[PDB]
Design an enzyme around this catalytic site. Structure first.
Site, PDB file in Angstrom:
ATOM      1  N   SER A 180       1.080  -1.112  -0.019  1.00  0.00           N
ATOM      2  CA  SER A 180       0.102  -0.169   0.040  1.00  0.00           C
ATOM      3  C   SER A 180       1.247   1.400   0.090  1.00  0.00           C
ATOM      4  O   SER A 180       1.146   1.436   0.980  1.00  0.00           O
ATOM      5  CB  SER A 180      -1.099  -0.252   1.091  1.00  0.00           C
ATOM      6  OG  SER A 180      -1.306   1.176   1.440  1.00  0.00           O
ATOM      7  N   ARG A 181       0.936   2.525  -1.006  1.00  0.00           N
ATOM      8  CA  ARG A 181       1.662   2.774  -1.200  1.00  0.00           C
ATOM      9  C   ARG A 181       1.472   4.623  -0.967  1.00  0.00           C
ATOM     10  O   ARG A 181       2.162   5.287  -0.082  1.00  0.00           O
ATOM     11  CB  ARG A 181       2.192   3.614  -2.587  1.00  0.00           C
ATOM     12  CG  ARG A 181       3.194   2.419  -3.534  1.00  0.00           C
ATOM     13  CD  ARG A 181       2.885   2.165  -4.624  1.00  0.00           C
ATOM     14  NE  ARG A 181       3.186   3.407  -6.176  1.00  0.00           N
ATOM     15  CZ  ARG A 181       4.083   2.908  -6.651  1.00  0.00           C
ATOM     16  NH1 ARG A 181       4.738   2.703  -6.676  1.00  0.00           N
ATOM     17  NH2 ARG A 181       4.732   3.828  -7.309  1.00  0.00           N
TER      18      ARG A 181
END
Lengths: 119, 192, 75, 227
Positions: free
Chosen positions: B55-56
């Site tokens: 999850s950036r």
């Protein structure tokens, strides 16, 4: 033409046995690659011992290749080839180094080359 | 000040993410969640894989309590995932191999869930805090699910202020009060 | 004096006692502190320091300390 | 050259790598435990060697049958091998040494004798058509004295009975984790014995002769267990 009635009966058996030992050696290449030679049965080590010698004795020195290497070149009749491979399969020459079998005509030349190698 | 969140689905064949559309959609989104078919058959719900999920946006989409709690859990799961396949051969280094195996099994049991019945974030924070602080080693692996269920039941009666503190402030309560509450619950939970 | 009863697997006891008495194959005997050096076998019996089982031993009396090279010296 | 064949070969090789890594870590743990066992065992060896060196020199104490050379008529061999493989040349080296020693100057089948510790050596000698005396196998990974106390006592007793006038043992010495030596020596015939320069004459409750009589088998057993 590799039939018992065309080439003979001794020739056929010798060729079939040589091919069988080469195939058996071919089957054991991966396990030798990963584990090694220490995890094999006695019969398998014998198979490898004879197979390396056979594979090296299938080579030859040619007349037209003299200008590359230097050896004069060789010619072998059929009966001599059958005799030599029959002796190899019988364990007659199991003590000589495996390198003495490369680039020779007959098996007497194998004996001479081993003699000149200090063995 | 409005917003719109998107959750697209992509189905693979035989777990092959090299295909044209799967690589097309992976490179547009802000991270992916990976579900495995091996874990689904065995009975792990949901069958999420944390070794390939990213999850950036990261921790900016989290509350302070979850930030303070989730790092140790991530590190523990990462450590356990490497040695999970070698549980058949014990007799390993007694120092930090079977201890990590036990911690990892306790982690894996905490992350299991059942269909419907979602969980409030304060309850998730409190149970993950209990797991990460070493409050679950005495409880055997086969009782972790029942332990967490009875802990949730316990908090609804005698833990009515820690939950309100987390809801109103968004930060986890005082460490000594949390330790005393978890100590008080453990004396009542009867372990089979 | 303090005694050290040692089995081949490892040390068994290192108890310190004021008086020592070690049974021998020929006959029972006690050892006074500051004793003469004595060598004697150990019969299968329970040694009693009195301020343990032994089956196969070797008494090595030395004034500095007494070491029992016993085998399977359980308690 | 299909992709499926390459994929399945990759999978098989990966699984074999997993197996080998697991065995490697287990073996490191077992090495630690074995070193612990040996270092715990050493003090008794130190004490017994010191005592025997102290007593068995000067002031008589000679002419012991265990210590005096005798015309050799039968020889015995004790070999320490493993039970299973997966060790690189750990068994083959010692077995080759034993075979070459036997085929050098032990022509008569009744001249020599063999006692083995590992199953690999036992099967090796069965395939090579030699007669054994005793065979012990399935020994644990951290053995102690009580495990083969009986076997060692039987060996020293049958030497004391006059069966073999010479005793020999062949084993592997741990120099380092990588370097490994193959060593050999006579054990029971005791042609040469050690000595120390701190000996104390002491006193003999059962006399020197009986003292040595009871002492020597313990020395033999202790040397066997060190090896």
């Amino acid at each position: 033409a590799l039939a018992p009635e065309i080439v003979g009966e001794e020739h056929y058996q010798v060729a079939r046995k040589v091919q069988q030992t080469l195939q058996r050696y071919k089957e054991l290449q991966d396990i030798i690659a990963i584990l090694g030679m220490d995890e094999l049965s006695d019969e398998d080590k014998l198979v490898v011992h004879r197979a390396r010698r056979i594979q090296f004795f299938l080579s030859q020195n040619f007349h037209v290749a003299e200008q590359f290497t230097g050896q004069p070149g060789s010619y072998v009749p059929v009966k001599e080839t059958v005799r030599g491979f029959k002796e190899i399969l019988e364990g007659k020459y199991d003590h000589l180094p495996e390198d003495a079998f490369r680039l020779v005509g007959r098996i007497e030349e194998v004996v001479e080359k081993a003699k000149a190698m200090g063995v | 000040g409005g917003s719109l969140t998107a959750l697209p689905f992509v189905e693979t064949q035989a777990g092959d993410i090299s295909a044209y559309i799967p690589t097309n959609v992976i490179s547009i989104t802000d991270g992916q969640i990976f579900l495995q078919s091996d874990l689904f058959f065995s009975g792990v719900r949901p069958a999420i894989n944390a070794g390939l999920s990213v999850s950036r946006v990261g921790g900016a989409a989290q509350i302070k309590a979850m930030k303070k709690v989730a790092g140790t859990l991530r590190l523990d799961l990462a450590a356990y995932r490497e040695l999970e396949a070698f549980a058949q051969f014990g007799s390993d280094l007694d120092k930090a191999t079977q201890a990590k195996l036990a911690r990892g099994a306790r982690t894996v049991e905490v992350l299991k869930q059942d269909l419907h019945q979602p969980i409030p974030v304060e309850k998730q924070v409190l149970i993950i805090y209990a797991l990460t602080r070493g409050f679950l080693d005495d409880i055997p692996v086969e009782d972790v699910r029942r332990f967490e269920k009875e802990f949730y039941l316990f908090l609804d009666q005698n833990g009515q202020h820690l939950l309100e503190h987390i809801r109103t402030t968004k930060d986890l309560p005082n460490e000594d009060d949390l330790n005393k509450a978890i100590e008080a619950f453990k004396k009542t939970f009867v372990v089979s | 004096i303090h005694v050290s009863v040692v089995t081949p697997d490892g040390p068994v006891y290192e108890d310190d006692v004021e008086m020592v008495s070690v049974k021998a194959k020929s006959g029972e005997l006690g050892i006074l502190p500051g004793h003469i050096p004595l060598v004697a076998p150990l019969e299968i019996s329970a040694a009693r320091l009195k301020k343990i089982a032994v089956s196969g031993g070797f008494l090595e009396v030395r004034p500095d300390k007494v070491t029992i090279l016993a085998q399977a010296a359980e308690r | 050259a299909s992709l499926r064949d390459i994929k399945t070969r990759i999978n098989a090789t990966k699984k074999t790598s997993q197996i080998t890594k697991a065995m490697e870590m287990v073996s490191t743990s077992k090495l630690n435990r074995a070193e612990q066992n040996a270092k715990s065992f050493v003090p008794y060896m130190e004490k017994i060697q010191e005592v025997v060196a102290n007593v068995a020199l000067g002031a008589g104490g000679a002419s012991h049958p265990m210590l005096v050379s005798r015309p050799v008529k039968k020889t015995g061999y004790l070999v320490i091998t493993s039970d299973r493989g997966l060790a690189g040349a750990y068994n083959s080296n010692v077995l080759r040494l034993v075979y070459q020693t036997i085929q050098k100057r032990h022509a008569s089948p009744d001249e020599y004798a063999i006692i083995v510790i590992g199953r690999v050596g036992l099967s090796f000698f069965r395939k090579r058509n030699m007669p054994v005396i005793l065979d012990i196998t399935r020994l644990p990974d951290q053995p102690s004295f009580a495990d083969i106390k009986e076997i060692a006592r039987k060996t020293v007793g049958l030497f004391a009975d006059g069966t073999f006038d010479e005793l020999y043992m062949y084993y592997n010495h741990y120099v380092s984790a990588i370097q490994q030596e193959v060593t050999e020596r006579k054990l029971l015939p005791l042609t040469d014995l050690a000595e120390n320069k701190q000996r104390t004459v002491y006193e003999f409750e059962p006399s020197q002769e009986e003292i040595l009589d009871v002492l020597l088998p313990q020395y033999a057993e202790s040397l066997i267990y060190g090896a």
